[PDB]
Structure formats: structure tokens, C-alpha cells
CSV table of C-alpha atoms in Angstrom, one decimal:
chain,number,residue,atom,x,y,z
A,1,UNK,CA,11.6,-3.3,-31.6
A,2,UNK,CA,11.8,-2.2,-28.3
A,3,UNK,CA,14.4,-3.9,-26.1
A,4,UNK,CA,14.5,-3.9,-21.7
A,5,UNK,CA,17.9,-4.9,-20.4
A,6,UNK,CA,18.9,-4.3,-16.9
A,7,UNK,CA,22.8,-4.2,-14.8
A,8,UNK,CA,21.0,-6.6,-12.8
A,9,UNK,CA,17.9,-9.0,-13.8
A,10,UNK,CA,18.7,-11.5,-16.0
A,11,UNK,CA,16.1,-12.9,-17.6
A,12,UNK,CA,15.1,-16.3,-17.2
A,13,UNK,CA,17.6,-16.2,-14.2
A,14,UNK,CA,17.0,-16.5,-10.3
A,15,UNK,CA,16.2,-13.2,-8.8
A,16,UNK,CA,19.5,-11.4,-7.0
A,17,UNK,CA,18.3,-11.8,-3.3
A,18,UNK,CA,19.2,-7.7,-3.9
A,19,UNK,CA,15.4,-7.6,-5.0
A,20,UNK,CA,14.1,-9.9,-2.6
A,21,UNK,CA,11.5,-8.5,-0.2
A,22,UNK,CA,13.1,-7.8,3.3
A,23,UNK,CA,10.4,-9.5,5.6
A,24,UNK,CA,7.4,-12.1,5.4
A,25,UNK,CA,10.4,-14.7,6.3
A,26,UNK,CA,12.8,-13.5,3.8
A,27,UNK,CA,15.6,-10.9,4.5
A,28,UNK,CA,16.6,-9.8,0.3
A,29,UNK,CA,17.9,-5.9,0.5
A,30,UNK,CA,14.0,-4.8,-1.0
A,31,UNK,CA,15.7,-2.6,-3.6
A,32,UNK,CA,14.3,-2.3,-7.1
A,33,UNK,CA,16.2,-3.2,-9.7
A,34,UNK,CA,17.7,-1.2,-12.5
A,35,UNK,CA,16.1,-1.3,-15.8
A,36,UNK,CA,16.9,0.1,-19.4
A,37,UNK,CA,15.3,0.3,-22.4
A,38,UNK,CA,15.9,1.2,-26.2
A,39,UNK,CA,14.1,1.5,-29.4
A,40,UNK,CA,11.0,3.0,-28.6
A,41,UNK,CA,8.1,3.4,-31.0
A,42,UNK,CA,7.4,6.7,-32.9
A,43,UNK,CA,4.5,8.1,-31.1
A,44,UNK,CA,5.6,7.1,-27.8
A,45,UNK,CA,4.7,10.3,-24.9
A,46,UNK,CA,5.3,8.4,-21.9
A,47,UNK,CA,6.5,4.8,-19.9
A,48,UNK,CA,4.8,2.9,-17.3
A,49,UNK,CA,7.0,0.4,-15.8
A,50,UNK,CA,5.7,-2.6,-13.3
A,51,UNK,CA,6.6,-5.5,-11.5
A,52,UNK,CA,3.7,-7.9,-11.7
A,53,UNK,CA,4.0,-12.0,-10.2
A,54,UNK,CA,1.5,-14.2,-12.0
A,55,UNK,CA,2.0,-16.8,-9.9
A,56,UNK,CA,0.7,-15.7,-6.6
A,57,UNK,CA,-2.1,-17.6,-5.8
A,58,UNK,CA,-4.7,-14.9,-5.3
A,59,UNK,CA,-7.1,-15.2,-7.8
A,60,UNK,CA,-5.4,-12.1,-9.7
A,61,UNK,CA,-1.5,-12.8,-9.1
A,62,UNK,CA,0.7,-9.5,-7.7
A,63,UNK,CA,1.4,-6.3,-8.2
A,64,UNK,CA,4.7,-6.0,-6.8
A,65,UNK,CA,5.6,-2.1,-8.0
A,66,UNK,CA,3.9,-0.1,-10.6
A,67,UNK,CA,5.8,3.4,-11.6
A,68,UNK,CA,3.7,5.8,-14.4
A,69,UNK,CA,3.6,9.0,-16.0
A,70,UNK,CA,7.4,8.7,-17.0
A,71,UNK,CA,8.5,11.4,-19.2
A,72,UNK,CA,8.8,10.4,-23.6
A,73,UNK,CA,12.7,10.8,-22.7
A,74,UNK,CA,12.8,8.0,-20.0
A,75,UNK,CA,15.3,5.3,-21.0
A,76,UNK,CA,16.3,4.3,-17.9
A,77,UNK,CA,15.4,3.7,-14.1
A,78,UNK,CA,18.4,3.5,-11.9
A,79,UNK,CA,18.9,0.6,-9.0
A,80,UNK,CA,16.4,1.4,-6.0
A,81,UNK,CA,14.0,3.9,-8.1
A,82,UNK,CA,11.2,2.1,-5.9
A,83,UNK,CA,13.5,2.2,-2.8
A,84,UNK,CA,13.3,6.1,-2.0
A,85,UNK,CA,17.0,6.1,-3.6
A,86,UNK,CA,16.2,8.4,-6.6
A,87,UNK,CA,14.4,11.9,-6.7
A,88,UNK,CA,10.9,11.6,-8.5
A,89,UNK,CA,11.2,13.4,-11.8
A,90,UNK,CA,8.5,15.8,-12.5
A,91,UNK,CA,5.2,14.4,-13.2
A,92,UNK,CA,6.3,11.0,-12.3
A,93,UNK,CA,4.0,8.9,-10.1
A,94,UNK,CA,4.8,5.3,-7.7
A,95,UNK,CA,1.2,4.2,-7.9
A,96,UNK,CA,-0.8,1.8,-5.7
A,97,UNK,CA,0.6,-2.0,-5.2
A,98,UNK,CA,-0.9,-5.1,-4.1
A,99,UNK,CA,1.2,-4.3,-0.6
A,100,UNK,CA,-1.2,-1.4,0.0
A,101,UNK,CA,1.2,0.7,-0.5
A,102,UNK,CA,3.2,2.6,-3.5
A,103,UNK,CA,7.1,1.8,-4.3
A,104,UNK,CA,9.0,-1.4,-5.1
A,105,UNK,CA,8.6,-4.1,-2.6
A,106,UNK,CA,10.4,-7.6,-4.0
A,107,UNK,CA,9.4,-11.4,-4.3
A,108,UNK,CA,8.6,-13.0,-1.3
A,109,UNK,CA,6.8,-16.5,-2.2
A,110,UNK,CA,5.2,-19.3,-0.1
A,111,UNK,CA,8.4,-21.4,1.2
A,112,UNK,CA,10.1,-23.7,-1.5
A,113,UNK,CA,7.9,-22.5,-4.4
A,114,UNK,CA,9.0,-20.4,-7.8
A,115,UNK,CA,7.8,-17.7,-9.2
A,116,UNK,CA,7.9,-15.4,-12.2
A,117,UNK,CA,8.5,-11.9,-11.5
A,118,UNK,CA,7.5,-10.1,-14.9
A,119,UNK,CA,8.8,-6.6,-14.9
A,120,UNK,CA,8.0,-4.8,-17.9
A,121,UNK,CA,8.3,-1.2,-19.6
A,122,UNK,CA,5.2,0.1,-21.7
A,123,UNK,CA,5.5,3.0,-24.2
A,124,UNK,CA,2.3,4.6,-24.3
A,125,UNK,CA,0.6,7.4,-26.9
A,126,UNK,CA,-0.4,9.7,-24.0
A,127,UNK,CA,1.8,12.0,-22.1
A,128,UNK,CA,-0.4,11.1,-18.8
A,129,UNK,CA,-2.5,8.8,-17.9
A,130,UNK,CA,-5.3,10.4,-15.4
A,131,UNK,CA,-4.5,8.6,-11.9
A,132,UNK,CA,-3.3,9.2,-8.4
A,133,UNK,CA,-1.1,7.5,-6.2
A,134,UNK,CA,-4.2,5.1,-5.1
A,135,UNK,CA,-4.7,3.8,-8.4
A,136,UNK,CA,-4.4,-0.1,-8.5
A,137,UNK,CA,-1.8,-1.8,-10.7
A,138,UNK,CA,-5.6,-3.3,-12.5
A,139,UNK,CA,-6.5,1.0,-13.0
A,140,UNK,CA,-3.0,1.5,-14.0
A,141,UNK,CA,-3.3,-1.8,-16.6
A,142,UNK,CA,-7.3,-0.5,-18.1
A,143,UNK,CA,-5.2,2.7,-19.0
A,144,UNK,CA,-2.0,0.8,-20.6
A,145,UNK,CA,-4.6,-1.7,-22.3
A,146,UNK,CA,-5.8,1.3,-24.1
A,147,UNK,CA,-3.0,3.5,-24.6
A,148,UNK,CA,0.1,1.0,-25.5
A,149,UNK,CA,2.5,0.9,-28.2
A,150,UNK,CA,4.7,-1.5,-27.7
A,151,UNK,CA,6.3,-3.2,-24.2
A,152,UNK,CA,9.1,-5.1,-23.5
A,153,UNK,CA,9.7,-7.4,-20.0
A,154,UNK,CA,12.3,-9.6,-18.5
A,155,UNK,CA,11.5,-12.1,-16.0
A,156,UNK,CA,13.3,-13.1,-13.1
A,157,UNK,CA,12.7,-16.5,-11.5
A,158,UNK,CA,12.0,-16.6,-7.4
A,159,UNK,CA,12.9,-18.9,-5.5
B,1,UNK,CA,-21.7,-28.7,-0.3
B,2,UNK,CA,-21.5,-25.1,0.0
B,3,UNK,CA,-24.6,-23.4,-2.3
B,4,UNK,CA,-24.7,-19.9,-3.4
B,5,UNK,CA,-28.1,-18.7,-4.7
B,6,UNK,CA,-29.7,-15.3,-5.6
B,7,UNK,CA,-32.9,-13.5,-5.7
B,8,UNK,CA,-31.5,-11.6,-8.5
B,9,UNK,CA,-28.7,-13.2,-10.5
B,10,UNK,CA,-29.2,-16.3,-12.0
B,11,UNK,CA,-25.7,-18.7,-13.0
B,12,UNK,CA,-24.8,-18.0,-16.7
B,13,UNK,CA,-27.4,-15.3,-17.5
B,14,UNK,CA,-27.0,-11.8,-18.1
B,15,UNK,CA,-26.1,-9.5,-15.0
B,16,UNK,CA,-29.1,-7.4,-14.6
B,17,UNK,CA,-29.0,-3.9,-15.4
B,18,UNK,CA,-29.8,-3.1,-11.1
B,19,UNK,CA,-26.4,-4.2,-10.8
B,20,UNK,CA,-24.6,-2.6,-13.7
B,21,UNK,CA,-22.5,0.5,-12.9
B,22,UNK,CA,-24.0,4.0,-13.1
B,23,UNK,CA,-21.3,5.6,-15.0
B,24,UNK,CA,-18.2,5.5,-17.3
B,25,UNK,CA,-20.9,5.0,-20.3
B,26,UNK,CA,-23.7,3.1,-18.5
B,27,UNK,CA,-26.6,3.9,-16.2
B,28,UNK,CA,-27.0,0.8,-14.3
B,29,UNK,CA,-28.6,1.4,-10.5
B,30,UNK,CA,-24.8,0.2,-9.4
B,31,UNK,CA,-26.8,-1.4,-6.6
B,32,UNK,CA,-24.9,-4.8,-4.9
B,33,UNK,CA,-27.0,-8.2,-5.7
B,34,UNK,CA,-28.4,-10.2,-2.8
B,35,UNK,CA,-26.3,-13.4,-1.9
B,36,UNK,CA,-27.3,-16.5,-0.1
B,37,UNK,CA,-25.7,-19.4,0.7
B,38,UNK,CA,-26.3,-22.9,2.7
B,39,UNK,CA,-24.4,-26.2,3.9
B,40,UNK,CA,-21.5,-24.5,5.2
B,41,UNK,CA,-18.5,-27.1,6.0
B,42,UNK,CA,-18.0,-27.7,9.5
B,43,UNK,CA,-15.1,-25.7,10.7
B,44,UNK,CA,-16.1,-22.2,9.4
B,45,UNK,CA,-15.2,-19.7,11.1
B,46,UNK,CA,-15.9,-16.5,8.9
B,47,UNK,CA,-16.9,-16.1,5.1
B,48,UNK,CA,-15.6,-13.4,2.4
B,49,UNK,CA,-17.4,-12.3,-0.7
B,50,UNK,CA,-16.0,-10.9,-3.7
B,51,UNK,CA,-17.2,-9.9,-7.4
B,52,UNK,CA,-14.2,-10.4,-9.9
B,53,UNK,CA,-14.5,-9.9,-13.7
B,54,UNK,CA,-11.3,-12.3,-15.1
B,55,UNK,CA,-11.6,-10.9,-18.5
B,56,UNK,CA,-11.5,-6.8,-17.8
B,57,UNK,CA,-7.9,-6.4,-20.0
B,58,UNK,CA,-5.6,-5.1,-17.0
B,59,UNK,CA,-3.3,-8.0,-17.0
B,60,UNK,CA,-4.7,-9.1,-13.3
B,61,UNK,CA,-8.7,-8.6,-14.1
B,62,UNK,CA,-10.7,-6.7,-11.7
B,63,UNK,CA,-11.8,-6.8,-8.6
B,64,UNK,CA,-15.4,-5.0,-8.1
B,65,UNK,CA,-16.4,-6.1,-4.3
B,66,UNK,CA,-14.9,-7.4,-1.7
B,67,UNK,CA,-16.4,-8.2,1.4
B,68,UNK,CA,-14.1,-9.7,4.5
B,69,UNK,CA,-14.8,-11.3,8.1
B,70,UNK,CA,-18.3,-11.7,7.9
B,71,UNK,CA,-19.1,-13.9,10.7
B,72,UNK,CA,-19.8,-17.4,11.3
B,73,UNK,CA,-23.2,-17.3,11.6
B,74,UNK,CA,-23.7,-14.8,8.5
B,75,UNK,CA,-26.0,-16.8,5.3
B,76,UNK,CA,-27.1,-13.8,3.3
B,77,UNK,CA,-26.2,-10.7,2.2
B,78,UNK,CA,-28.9,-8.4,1.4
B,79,UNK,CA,-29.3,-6.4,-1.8
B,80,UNK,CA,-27.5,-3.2,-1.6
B,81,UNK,CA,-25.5,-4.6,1.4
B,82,UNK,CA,-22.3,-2.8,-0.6
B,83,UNK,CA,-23.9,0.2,-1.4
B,84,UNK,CA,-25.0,1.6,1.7
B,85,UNK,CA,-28.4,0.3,1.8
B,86,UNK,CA,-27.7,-1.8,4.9
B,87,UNK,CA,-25.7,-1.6,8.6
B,88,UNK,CA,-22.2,-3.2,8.9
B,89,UNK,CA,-22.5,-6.1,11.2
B,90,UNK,CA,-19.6,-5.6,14.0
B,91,UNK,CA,-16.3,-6.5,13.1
B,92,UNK,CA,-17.2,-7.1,9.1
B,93,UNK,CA,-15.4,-5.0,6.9
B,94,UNK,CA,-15.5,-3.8,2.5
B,95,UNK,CA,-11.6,-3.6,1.5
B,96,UNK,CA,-10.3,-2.2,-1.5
B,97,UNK,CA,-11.1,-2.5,-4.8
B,98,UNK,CA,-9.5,-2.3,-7.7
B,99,UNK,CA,-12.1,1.1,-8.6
B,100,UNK,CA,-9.8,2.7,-5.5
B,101,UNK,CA,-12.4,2.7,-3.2
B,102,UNK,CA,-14.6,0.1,-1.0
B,103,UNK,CA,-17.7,-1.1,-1.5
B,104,UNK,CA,-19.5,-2.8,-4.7
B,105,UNK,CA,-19.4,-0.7,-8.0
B,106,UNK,CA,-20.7,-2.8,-11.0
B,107,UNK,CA,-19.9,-3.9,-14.5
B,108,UNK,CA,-18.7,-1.4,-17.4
B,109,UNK,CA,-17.0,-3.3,-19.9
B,110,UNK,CA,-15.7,-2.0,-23.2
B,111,UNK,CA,-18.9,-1.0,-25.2
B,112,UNK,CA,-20.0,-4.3,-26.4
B,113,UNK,CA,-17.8,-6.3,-24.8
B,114,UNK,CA,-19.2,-9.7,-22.6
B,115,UNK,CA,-17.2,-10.4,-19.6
B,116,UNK,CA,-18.0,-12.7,-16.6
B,117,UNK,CA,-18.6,-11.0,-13.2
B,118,UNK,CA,-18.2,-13.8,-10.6
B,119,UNK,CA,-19.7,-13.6,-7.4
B,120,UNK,CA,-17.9,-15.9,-4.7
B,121,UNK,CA,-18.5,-16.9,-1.0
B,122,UNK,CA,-15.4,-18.2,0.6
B,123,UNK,CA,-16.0,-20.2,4.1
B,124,UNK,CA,-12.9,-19.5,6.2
B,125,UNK,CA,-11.1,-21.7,9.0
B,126,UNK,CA,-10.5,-18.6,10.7
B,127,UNK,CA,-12.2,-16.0,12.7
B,128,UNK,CA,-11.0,-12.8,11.2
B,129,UNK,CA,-7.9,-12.2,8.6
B,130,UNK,CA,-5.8,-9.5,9.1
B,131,UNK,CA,-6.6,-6.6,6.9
B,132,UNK,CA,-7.8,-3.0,7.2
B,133,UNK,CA,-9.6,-1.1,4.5
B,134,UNK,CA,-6.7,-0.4,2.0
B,135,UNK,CA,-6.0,-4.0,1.5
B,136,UNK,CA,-6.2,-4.8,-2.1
B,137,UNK,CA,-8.7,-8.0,-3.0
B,138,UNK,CA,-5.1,-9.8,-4.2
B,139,UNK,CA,-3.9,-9.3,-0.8
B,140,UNK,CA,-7.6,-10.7,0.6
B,141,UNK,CA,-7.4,-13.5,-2.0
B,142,UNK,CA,-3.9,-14.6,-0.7
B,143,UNK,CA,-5.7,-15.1,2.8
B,144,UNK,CA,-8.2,-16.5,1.5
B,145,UNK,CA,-5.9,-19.1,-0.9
B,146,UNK,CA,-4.1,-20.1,2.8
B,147,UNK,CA,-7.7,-20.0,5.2
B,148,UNK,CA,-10.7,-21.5,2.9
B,149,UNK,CA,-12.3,-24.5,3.4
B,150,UNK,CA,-14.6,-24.1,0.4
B,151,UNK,CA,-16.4,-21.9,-2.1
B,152,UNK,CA,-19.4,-21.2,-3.8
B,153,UNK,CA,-20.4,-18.6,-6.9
B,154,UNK,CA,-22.7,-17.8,-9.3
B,155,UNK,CA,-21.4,-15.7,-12.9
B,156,UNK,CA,-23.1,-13.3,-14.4
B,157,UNK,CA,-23.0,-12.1,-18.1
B,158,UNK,CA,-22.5,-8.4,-19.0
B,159,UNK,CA,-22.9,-6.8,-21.4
């Protein structure tokens, strides 16, 4: 039963302004948080871990981080992973957000409103899924759709 | 009362094969469906198109078109308009999918699975949004959420 705790999320709880984005009228440090997981499924050859927002009124919410191809030993992804604060295992690829770009950038709602801010870890049966660093987090999600064996999220309330 | 018609598509029929993908399983012509609309609210300053499936199982849907800053004056798109068949009008741009790439690319859906593929025309309040090329269609769809004065759309069936 696959479990996702994290030395900083709490879930249900108000997002740590640690994770907050840094601009767009907010000033949060933009630093992904840490997540761990445990339990995993027999089977499992890889992770993909994302940061997706529901909530944003878009017509397809937010893809606020979206990290795949993590090795079948991954069991944890230390503070600021997204940030350019840890080196990229091999293999590992930061693939294509909403922000047009690839890393972790944090919540940064329409003023006064609240948000869920789902982050959540996928085992998956395949040791790779076959993307690039343009894939969007809706490529990335077709593949885990497909390939999952379990997940497990917390969700952090902003603001 | 904004109306969006089309010489091809028809509002809760089947998408024609023309405008069903030409790969990953299929052999649809992949070609974009002609788009017209009327009674534009007064105030409209630009329009933007888009073709989102909400069932594709990604966790955010799909985005298979989008079409941004058309002008003011702009009532039609021909067939083909996003697949090369006709000249960009100045300033009008095709932003990012969620296929990685610009421009229209059609339905695919898990072998006999029936999705919706929406067509929509957004009228804007403002002349141009501020995007490039790489912007994803949740990034459009947030400037369009804070910019439209109305929409249109017709959905079609596939498969």
C-alpha cells in the first residue's frame, strides 16, 4: 500500500510559502518540496512524480512540475529536486510544465482564492517511458494511464 | 449570441474520418475542420480557437489545436487552416499542444473508445494575449478564463 510522506507538505495543510512560486505577485522561495515514499508494488521499474493544480481555471487545471524516468530504487526526492539543487540521476528527465518550461515552479493562484496542489508519486511497470524534455504533463499522464501500478499523493492547500 | 457552425462537423455526431489523426493506429487525413462563427459581442477584440478532448485519460485531458490572436475581424477558419493548407494572417499564431508541437493533429483514442473532441471560439476583450509558440493551451486557457467575453463550440464524436 504505497505511502508518500514528505519533511515538508502536509497534507490537507496550507502550502509552506517555501513552495510558493517567486513572482506573478507572490514572492514564496519557488523550491520543490521534499517527497518520500514506501511500499512500492512488486513489478514496479520506475516513478514519475508531478505537481498537478485542478483548480486553475483553464479548462485543463496545471501542471506545475512533472519529473519521470526515475530509477525502480527511487524512494525519495530531496528539497529543491525541481530547483536545480540536486544532480539529475542517470536517465532521469524534468519534463515539460504548463509554465513552458521543465522544473518545479510553485502555486501562485488568482488573489484570495484556494487551491489544491496534488503532488503525487506513480510506480510504473516500465523502466522508461519514451519522452523528451518537451513532453506535456497530458503526454507524460497517456503514458502513466497505461503503465501504472499504484500512486500515492498529498495535497497541499494554496492560499 | 455567439454561433459556431461547420461545413464539416455537425454538434453531437461522429468526427469525420478527414479529421481523424493519420497515425498511432488510425489513418484519418489529420486535416483541421472548417469553423465559422457569427454575432460576435460588441467589445471583441481578438478570438482563440481550440480542439480539447475532456475524456483522453491524462489526468488534465488533451489539448489537440490551439489557435491564438486571431483578429477582430476574423469569422472563419478555413479547412486545413492548422495543417498547412492556408497562410497565417499577421500577428495570429498556433501554440502548443499537448502532441508537443503546434498546429491541429486529430483524434486517436484508445481502440474503441468514444471521446468528445470540442471545438471552441473564444471572443476576447483584448487585442493580443501574451504568448509565444511554446505556450501550453492551459497557459492560453488561463488568458482566455481572465479576457473572454463569450464562447461558442460544436463536439464531435470519435471513435
Amino acid at each position: 500500500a504505497m505511502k508518500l510522506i514528505s519533511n515538508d507538505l502536509r497534507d490537507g495543510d496550507k502550502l509552506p510559502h517555501r513552495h510558493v512560486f517567486n513572482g506573478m505577485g507572490y514572492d514564496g522561495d519557488n523550491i520543490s518540496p521534499h517527497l518520500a515514499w514506501d511500499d512500492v508494488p512488486a513489478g514496479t521499474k520506475s516513478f514519475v512524480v508531478t505537481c498537478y493544480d485542478p483548480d486553475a481555471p483553464t479548462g485543463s487545471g496545471w501542471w506545475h512540475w512533472v519529473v519521470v524516468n526515475l530509477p525502480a530504487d527511487t524512494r525519495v526526492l530531496p528539497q529543491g529536486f525541481g530547483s536545480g539543487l540536486v544532480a539529475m540521476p542517470d536517465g532521469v528527465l524534468q519534463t515539460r510544465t504548463d509554465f513552458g518550461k521543465t522544473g518545479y515552479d510553485g502555486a501562485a493562484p488568482p488573489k484570495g482564492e484556494t487551491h489544491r496542489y496534488i503532488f503525487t508519486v506513480h510506480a510504473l511497470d516500465i523502466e522508461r517511458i519514451d519522452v523528451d524534455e518537451g513532453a506535456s504533463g497530458a503526454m507524460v499522464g497517456f503514458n502513466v494511464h497505461f503503465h501504472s501500478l499504484a500512486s500515492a499523493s498529498i495535497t497541499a492547500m494554496f492560499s
